[PDB]
Design a protein around this nucleic acid. Structure first.
Ligand SMILES: [Mg+2]
Ligand SMILES: [Mg+2]
Ligand SMILES: [Mg+2]
Ligand SMILES: [Mg+2]
Ligand SMILES: [Mg+2]
Ligand SMILES: [Mg+2]
Ligand SMILES: [Mg+2]
Ligand SMILES: [Mg+2]
Ligand SMILES: [Mg+2]
Ligand SMILES: [Mg+2]
Ligand SMILES: [Mg+2]
Ligand SMILES: [Mg+2]
Ligand SMILES: [Mg+2]
Ligand SMILES: [Mg+2]
Ligand SMILES: [Mg+2]
Ligand SMILES: [Mg+2]
Ligand SMILES: [Mg+2]
Ligand SMILES: [Mg+2]
Ligand SMILES: [Mg+2]
Ligand SMILES: [Mg+2]
Ligand SMILES: [Mg+2]
Ligand SMILES: [Mg+2]
Ligand SMILES: [Mg+2]
Lengths: 205, 114, 157
RNA sequence: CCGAGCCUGGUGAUAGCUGGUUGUCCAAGAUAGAAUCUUAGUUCAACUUUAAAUUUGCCCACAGAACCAAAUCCCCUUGUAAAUUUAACUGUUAGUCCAAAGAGGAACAGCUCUUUGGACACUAGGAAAAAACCUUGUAGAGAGAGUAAAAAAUUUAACACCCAUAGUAGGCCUAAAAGCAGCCACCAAUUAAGAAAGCGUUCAAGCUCAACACAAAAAUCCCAAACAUAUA
RNA sequence: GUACCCUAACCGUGCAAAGGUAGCAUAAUCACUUGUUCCUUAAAUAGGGACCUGUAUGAAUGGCUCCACGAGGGUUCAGCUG
RNA sequence: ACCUCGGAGCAGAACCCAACCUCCGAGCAGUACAUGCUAAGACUUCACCAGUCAAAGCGAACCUCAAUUGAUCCAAUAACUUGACCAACGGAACAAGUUACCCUAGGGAUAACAGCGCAAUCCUAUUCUAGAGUCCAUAUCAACAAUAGGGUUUACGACCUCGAUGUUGGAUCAGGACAUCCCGAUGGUGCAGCCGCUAUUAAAGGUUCGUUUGUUCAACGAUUAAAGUCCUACGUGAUCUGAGUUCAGACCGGAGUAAUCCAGGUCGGUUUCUAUCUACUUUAUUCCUCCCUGUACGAAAGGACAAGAGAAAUAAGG
RNA sequence: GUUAAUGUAGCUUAAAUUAUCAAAGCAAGGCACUGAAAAUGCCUAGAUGAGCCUCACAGCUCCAUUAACACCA
């Protein structure tokens, strides 16, 4: 098995109690799968979103098609879809309960690695077919390396000390300077202005 | 005897207002489908519900009875259960004979008792 | 509208006035930065060994010829003891003063091929050359003595 | 002008429903809920008003508040002048948008439902016009003054040149698959050219490469005018 | 549920007071419905004749023929006419 | 479907906190038989009613469980006590249908029509190259996906209007968009030619007549250069119609004990205005025939352009 | 479309846990032989797939199955 394995539509034990749209599994930085384990190339999520089962066959069928499975291998860094998402039978008025369970979905936060690659190849062998996989994901994504994930980290850490602005977001947000926490969320104390909804802004120091 | 299917394509579904059997809801509603077959000439309408999610899925169920006569003929599952379920009406009016014949043999033997 | 949306949600104006004030401002310098101030070493032995050993060297413009005929022009001097060498001018041109060849230096531009030997045949080579009416032979050097294409007629006859 | 005549009477029928409700000036004043044949209503709270009585009210610091995030509760000091209790009642209990945390829906709605907080149902300035965003609240006259918020920035895709011999049609399987169907090996000739990286031939042939050599489209008619250069 | 030029339940039963007979028939008769077919038309969701479960026909809730008749409701030949 | 009560989540940490929100329960059972009596001080389901905990003391001894429920009046009984799936659970002592024969009061607090919001649905364009196209992703088409834009549909929402904003089709007159059906210019072609396919640009002009049906549609007959797609309160009823829908009558099939009822069917059925105000009330296309020429094109069958001549037709003005 | 009901040995109902007898089929057992009357066994994935305990029981995954409402403008 040196290829991406099949990911099923539903959990084998189907979830029978419905869940709220707990949208704060999209919002913010990721805490699981931010670092590299067994690989050199991956697809970083630069934004939050939900992976349906169609994206899992977008990713699997176009990685097993453009890959040397003798020399490269690949590994899922997201689970199979688990979070049930309901839909009401169409045409109905509002109310009358929650809808029935339609399908499942995987929450991906920004900074998450989605699919990892490896084996014996350079980044330029893999940057070809992974960048086109990443553009068809429901969020902003990107092919990174081990070397270009730290080059994106040390450069952004450079932007924090290099900038000549006396006023950063994190200084105004915690000191509550202009009464600014009237407008901000309580998560912008920890997001520090780099996140707005599910969107991640890397041009913000 | 299953009814032979129809492709997802080649079906010119128009949506018009249609007949209106109601006050103001049914003049302005494009509820009537005109689900066509492009190969054969079989034009099917439907105003069976006030909802296309049961109009169109039932308009498809009618069309796969009409175009079934085209590609099979009078020996089809759409005429089998017309000649099998009106087979019983010759087993219902003949059945009803033989008991209205033996309801006079027991009615004349009645009251000719003494 | 929720907190996490499909579309980038509009901000409050006091928030958007803050996401303009705290933007990244890069350092701008005083003066712009740009506006201020084995393979060779082995061939650093071989042409030095060409000029210690050989007697008659002949230089030319041999890029002129086909893939078959340059093997043949190699083979037309294989019947003698003439061998033909090519060298990089990025490594052959500095050596000439390290072996003190001033009148051979303004001579190596473009494609140039040495045609070294230890005994000249080149009386017959010009007869081999007389059927390819291009490919002209330039100035040689025998034992620290230049000889032009005229110098290869005064000696070689 | 008959689903039960017409007149008079009971009769000023009743209406939780609609409409109306008349001098001047001033002041205090806005949105927890619960029950209800009730949710178009009402009673009690809550908020509000007036009078009276007394003494603490608000803001708050250590310490303190459970196991299976923002904050609050408590609370002396301090900064403040208000609070509770008593007396007497009315009204409001058919709300909105914005920021935030969520639930429902489609991570739709100027959507619906709670929670914390604003503003509006009151004034003035601004965002073009503008209930809800920002600035600012305590009243008058002035042909004084200083300010507050307050004006959108952007303009992108050129590119190599030269040059190509060879152990061989490497072997395998294959009709033959020859660098390029497929499997293994992937060495090697010369200064330098992969047992071939894309095309291409049934197969070949051939053409190259790697190699030495020098962002937009909609229905009456675009929508201030205009403007790169005078010192904060 | 065995009937085969698509044809003998040719047999087992459940339930009822009784299980719809003659006749008529896509009808002014739930839907499907513009049923299928022939005539009529250059062309027919109309008209007429047929077939037919009509699963919601049907016998004084009267059923079916039919004579006259109707400011009834459809169809039509010829004429005729802004 | 639901209505009263309890536990968990939403509601992370004092308390509180909705939902036709998400998941579990309850309408008892068991053991006592001091499950006797009294009484400080508190709690409290945001009110009241109810509901909780309780030191001491008297008398004795040496409750379990989250909910496990029901007020008043009355009825029983000598008394103690007892009495509701009063479950619409703060409970009227006891009351259903139906109305198109309908009535009054109101409501845009609340639906249908229109508008507006939104864009799931719908339509369209780019992105990605899997796949078809003998080979070849890109002549043509196109999966899983992604990014946008539209505002035609079916929804949803309930913001304006219920002291009235009258409608389907048709008639009449059409205004506009272009996402082009025809006519024009161009790029590609799996373009020889002729036809086509697609793409860029083009809104000047054009966009037929019939049989059935109320029909927009659709089918069909005949044509056409072509018989565009939409928007205009599903343009247009103080200009028209009234076949449909949509009142009072009636039949049939059905539901119902009946009255009556059905998105059923079918016959019938009053469409009002004398214009105050704004606004307004004489600014050429195309087809065919000939010709070129039956040439170029092609193995042949077939069979072009541009230029020019004529015939007609509609439109405009006479 | 939506709830709502239903499933029984080969043949009919049962049984509110544990599965029956009533027919038919195996014969034998009273009777000269046939008939019951007996005395047997017999055949139910209790129409599904998972197991929450331990379940035709109490419920979905289920498959077919029939009823019934999908309205007003
Ligand atoms: Mg009164
Ligand atoms: Mg009321
Ligand atoms: Mg009023
Ligand atoms: Mg005041
Ligand atoms: Mg204090
Ligand atoms: Mg709202
Ligand atoms: Mg002042
Ligand atoms: Mg090269
Ligand atoms: Mg008469
Ligand atoms: Mg209380
Ligand atoms: Mg005590
Ligand atoms: Mg009640
Ligand atoms: Mg109550
Ligand atoms: Mg009537
Ligand atoms: Mg409203
Ligand atoms: Mg509407
Ligand atoms: Mg509302
Ligand atoms: Mg109205
Ligand atoms: Mg009015
Ligand atoms: Mg265009
Ligand atoms: Mg209209
Ligand atoms: Mg009008
Ligand atoms: Mg009449």
């Amino acid at each position: 098995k040196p290829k991406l394995r099949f990911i099923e539509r539903a959990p084998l034990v189907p979830k029978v109690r419905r869940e709220p749209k707990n949208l704060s599994d999209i919002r913010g930085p990721s805490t699981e799968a931010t670092e590299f384990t067994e690989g050199n190339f991956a697809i970083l999520a630069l934004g939050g979103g939900y992976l349906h089962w169609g994206h899992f066959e977008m990713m699997r069928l176009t990685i097993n098609r453009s890959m040397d499975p003798k020399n490269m291998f690949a590994i899922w860094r997201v689970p199979a879809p688990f979070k049930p998402i309901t839909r009401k039978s169409v045409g109905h008025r509002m109310g009358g309960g929650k809808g029935a369970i339609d399908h499942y979905v995987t929450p991906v936060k920004a900074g998450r690695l989605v699919v990892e690659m490896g084996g014996r190849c350079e980044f330029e062998e893999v940057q070809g077919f992974l960048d086109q996989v990443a553009h068809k994901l429901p969020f902003a994504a990107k092919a990174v390396s081990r070397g270009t994930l730290e080059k994106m980290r040390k450069d952004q850490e450079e932007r924090e000390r290099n900038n000549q602005n006396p006023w950063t977001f994190e200084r105004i947000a915690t000191a509550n300077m202009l009464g600014i926490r009237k407008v901000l969320s309580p998560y912008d104390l920890t997001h520090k202005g780099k996140y707005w909804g599910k969107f991640y802004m890397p041009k913000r120091v | 005897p299953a009814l032979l299917s129809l492709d997802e394509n080649e079906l010119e579904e128009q949506f018009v207002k249609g007949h209106g059997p109601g006050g103001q809801a049914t003049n302005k509603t494009s509820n009537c489908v005109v689900l066509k077959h492009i190969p054969s000439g079989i034009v099917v309408k439907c105003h069976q519900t006030r909802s296309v999610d049961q109009n169109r899925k039932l308009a498809r169920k009618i069309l796969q009875e009409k175009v079934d006569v085209f590609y099979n003929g009078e020996n089809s599952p759409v005429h089998k259960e017309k000649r099998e379920a009106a087979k019983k009406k010759q087993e219902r009016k003949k059945r009803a004979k033989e008991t209205l014949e033996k309801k006079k043999l027991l009615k004349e033997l009645w009251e000719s008792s003494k | 509208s929720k907190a996490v949306t499909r579309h980038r949600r509009v901000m409050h104006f006091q928030r958007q006035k803050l996401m303009a004030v705290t933007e990244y401002i890069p350092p701008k310098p005083a003066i712009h930065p740009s506006c201020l101030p084995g393979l060779i070493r082995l061939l650093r032995r071989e042409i030095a060994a060409v000029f210690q050993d050989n007697r008659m060297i002949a230089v030319c413009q041999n890029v002129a010829l086909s893939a078959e005929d340059k093997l043949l022009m190699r083979h037309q001097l294989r019947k003698h003891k003439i061998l033909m060498k090519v060298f990089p001018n990025q490594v052959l041109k500095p050596f000439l003063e390290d072996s003190k060849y001033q009148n051979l230096l303004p001579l190596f531009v473009g494609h140039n091929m040495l045609l070294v030997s230890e005994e000249p045949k080149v009386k017959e080579m010009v007869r081999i050359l007389r059927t390819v009416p291009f490919l002209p032979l330039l100035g040689g050097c025998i034992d620290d003595t230049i000889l032009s294409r005229q110098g290869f007629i005064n000696y070689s006859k």
